[PDB]
């Protein structure tokens, strides 16, 4: 409603770097808000794509940002009569970024890994990896829970059970309030998907450069399954956390599986032990139900509510014809321990191929009315197809069905304006939470400052 669309703030990265593919707010140890920006095709030392991370100080004029430097060199370790190998070319460093406390976690989902032992090998596979940084102290750490040293032959003997070689860990990421990093790995267990959790403190204390394979005893991974409903389900394409079991001691996980059960898609709510509490099923096959998930209490009852995006949902129109527009689903959490019912509200896009619901960002209480609000992205929506971000205000019965405000892309065609979103942080310290929007196609980030209503 009250975001300012006249005086925006633009940040920019190198051309072709996909600057803005992912973004997050970052508060330093002093509470000064900056913007961490992932650029997963930034050139590395060998003039080759490796990705990169940028830490943008808040300036009303925006502009260029300094780099958050990481080690981009391939590693080789000959230990235990084996050969460990990391491959960082086209790893996509910055495809996901997330900030917790004074720590930044940037992941390279397509970092490859291999283990040679004489004429056998583990196969060169995208295990993924995440880089951790404490900018003020310069501390660096890494986390790659899906690396293994098992040779290819063993997986064939076990019919490829517990096969984490293609995790792409860090594809999605989130940190609990307690400081536990939770990584989505949609390729884990031979593309069923998995979650990897470990405390940030233990990741730092147990990491040393060069080891490549080390034990993080406090870590916790989800489990493989023989249920065909999960085969090729990409469990972990999107992840989020919230409070859904009435126990404020436990943190619950929200996972997206957009191809679950033969591309029907699903979203599951689990406890910290990966025991399923709820399952939300897709409405239409190939709609990619679960591409994005968002957790926020919208109706002001203190209970976290759920939002699921299905960017490829095909709306039914006249003369028995379908139209891909996208759809977002709102599930209000019922009082006490009860199952989430049917969707409390359906929001459906209007522009053909707009992909309404590609990203859903909690905004906090934008207009300061006591109810939390959300922003939904249609990266190829709007009458021009250039991209649109729509704001929906919370209310006692959930969300308003019509948007209070529509932000049209200020970038040219193909920018993918809205592919990434982040809100609920007051960057200019004016008392109103603001919104940062990524447009990796134009290698830029736009900041919308909220103003008095």
């Amino acid at each position, epitope marked *: 409603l009250n975001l300012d669309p006249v005086q925006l703030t633009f940040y920019a990265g190198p051309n072709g770097s996909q600057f803005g593919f992912s973004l997050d707010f970052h508060k330093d140890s002093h509470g000064r808000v900056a913007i961490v920006v992932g650029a997963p095709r930034t050139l590395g030392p060998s003039q080759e794509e490796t990705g990169g991370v940028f830490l943008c100080p808040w300036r009303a004029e925006g502009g260029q940002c300094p780099s958050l430097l990481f080690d981009l060199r391939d590693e080789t*370790r*000959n230990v*235990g009569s084996q050969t460990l190998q990391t491959f960082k070319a086209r790893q996509g460093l910055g495809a996901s970024v997330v900030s917790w406390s004074d720590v930044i976690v940037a992941c390279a989902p397509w970092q490859h890994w291999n283990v040679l032992e004489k004429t056998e090998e583990a196969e060169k596979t995208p295990v993924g990896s995440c880089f951790l940084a404490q900018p003020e102290s310069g501390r660096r750490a890494e986390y790659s829970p899906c690396r293994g040293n098992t040779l290819s032959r063993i997986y064939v003997e076990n019919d490829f059970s517990w096969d984490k070689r293609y995790c792409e860990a860090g594809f999605s990421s989130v940190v609990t309030q307690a400081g536990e990093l939770v990584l989505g790995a949609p390729g884990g267990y031979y593309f069923l998907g998995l979650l990897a959790q470990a405390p940030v403190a233990d990741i730092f204390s147990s990491y*040393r450069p060069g*080891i490549l*394979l*080390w*034990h993080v*005893s406090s870590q916790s991974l989800s489990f493989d399954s023989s249920n065909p409903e999960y085969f090729d389900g990409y469990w972990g394409y999107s992840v989020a956390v919230g409070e859904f079991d009435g126990d404020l001691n436990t943190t619950e996980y929200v996972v997206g599986a957009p191809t679950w059960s033969w591309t029907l898609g699903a979203v599951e709510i689990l406890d910290s032990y990966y025991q399923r509490l709820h399952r939300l099923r897709g409405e239409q096959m190939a709609s990619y139900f679960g591409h994005s998930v968002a957790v926020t209490d919208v109706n002001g009852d203190g209970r976290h509510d759920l939002l699921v995006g299905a960017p490829l949902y095909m709306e039914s129109r006249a003369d028995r014809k379908l139209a891909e527009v996208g759809r977002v689903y709102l599930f209000l959490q019922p009082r006490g321990p009860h199952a989430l019912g049917a969707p409390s509200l359906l929001l459906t896009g209007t522009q053909l191929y707009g992909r309404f619901g590609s990203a859903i960002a909690p905004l906090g209480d934008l207009d300061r009315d006591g109810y939390n609000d959300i922003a939904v992205a249609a990266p190829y929506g709007g009458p021009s197809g250039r991209g649109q971000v729509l704001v929906f205000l919370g209310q006692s019965e959930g969300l308003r069905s019509r948007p209070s405000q529509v932000l049209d892309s200020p970038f040219p065609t193909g920018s993918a304006f809205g592919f990434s979103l982040r809100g609920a942080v007051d960057i200019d310290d004016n008392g109103y939470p603001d919104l940062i929007v990524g447009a990796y196609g134009a290698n830029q980030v736009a900041v919308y400052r909220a103003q008095p209503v």
Partner: antibody, heavy 119, light 108 residues
Framework: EVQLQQSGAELVKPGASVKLSCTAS????????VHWVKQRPEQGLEWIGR????????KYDPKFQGKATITADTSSNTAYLQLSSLTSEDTAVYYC????????????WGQGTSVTVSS | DILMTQSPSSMSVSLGDTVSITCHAS??????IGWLQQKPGKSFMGLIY???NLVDGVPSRFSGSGSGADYSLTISSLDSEDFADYYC?????????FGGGTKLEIKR
């Protein structure tokens, strides 16, 4: 706290067999590699072999091929070392080892099990 | 197998001295080495892993260095509890092989 608790001292005759136990405490034996090391005053420290308790796969120094047999039981959270065809040269102190962080290191050691072979 | 030559066999030193124990491999092992301590009559306690990394709890006066086939364990300002046996071990190749050992003794 990680602790490796090994079985007590053994006093056996030549030609017999003995089976040493190394029980995990404060952690699951399945977490890491588990090694066995032999020690003597003159010959020093010799690496016998390792086991991955999660799957049972093992590695040995070929010097102990036939004499030593390393096994593990995740049920009882214990790793084992069986020595067959015992000789005075098998009289030694035997340790079980597991790494701290590095997958391949040798950082945590049990208290050692004493074996004496004599008629 | 990889041969680990450790030196010296023993040394007579005093409290506060800065002593170094060397370990030489028969081939390059690229810091895939660990250092161990065995106090008199007691079990083993790991000090260093992967060349230079201190095991959790080990005092900072211990420090490992070196590369290729030559490594060192340096103790700054010896404490009374530092008079013990010390060993190196390579884990670059199977089978793991240990150094001969070094005994620190009190000079008088």
């Amino acid at each position: 706290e990680v602790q490796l608790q090994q079985s007590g001292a053994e006093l056996v005759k030549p030609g017999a067999s003995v089976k040493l136990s190394c029980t995990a405490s404060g952690f699951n034996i399945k977490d890491t590699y588990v090694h066995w090391v032999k020690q003597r005053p003159e010959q020093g420290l010799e690496w016998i072999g390792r086991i991955d308790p999660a799957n049972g796969y093992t590695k040995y120094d070929p010097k102990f091929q036939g004499k030593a047999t390393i096994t593990a039981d995740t049920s009882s959270n214990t790793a084992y070392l069986q020595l067959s065809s015992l000789t005075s040269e098998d009289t030694a102190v035997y340790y079980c080892v597991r790494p701290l962080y590095d997958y391949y290191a040798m950082d945590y050691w049990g208290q050692g099990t004493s074996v004496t072979v004599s008629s | 197998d990889i041969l680990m030559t450790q030196s010296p066999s023993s040394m007579s030193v005093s409290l506060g001295d800065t002593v170094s124990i060397t370990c030489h491999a028969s081939q390059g092992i690229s810091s895939n080495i660990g250092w161990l301590q065995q106090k008199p009559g007691k079990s083993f306690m790991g000090l260093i892993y992967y060349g230079t990394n201190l095991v959790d709890g080990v005092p900072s006066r211990f420090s490992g260095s070196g590369s290729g086939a030559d490594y060192s364990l340096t103790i700054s300002s010896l404490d009374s509890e530092d008079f013990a046996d010390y060993y190196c071990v390579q884990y670059a190749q199977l089978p793991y092989t240990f150094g001969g050992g070094t005994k620190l003794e009190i000079k008088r």
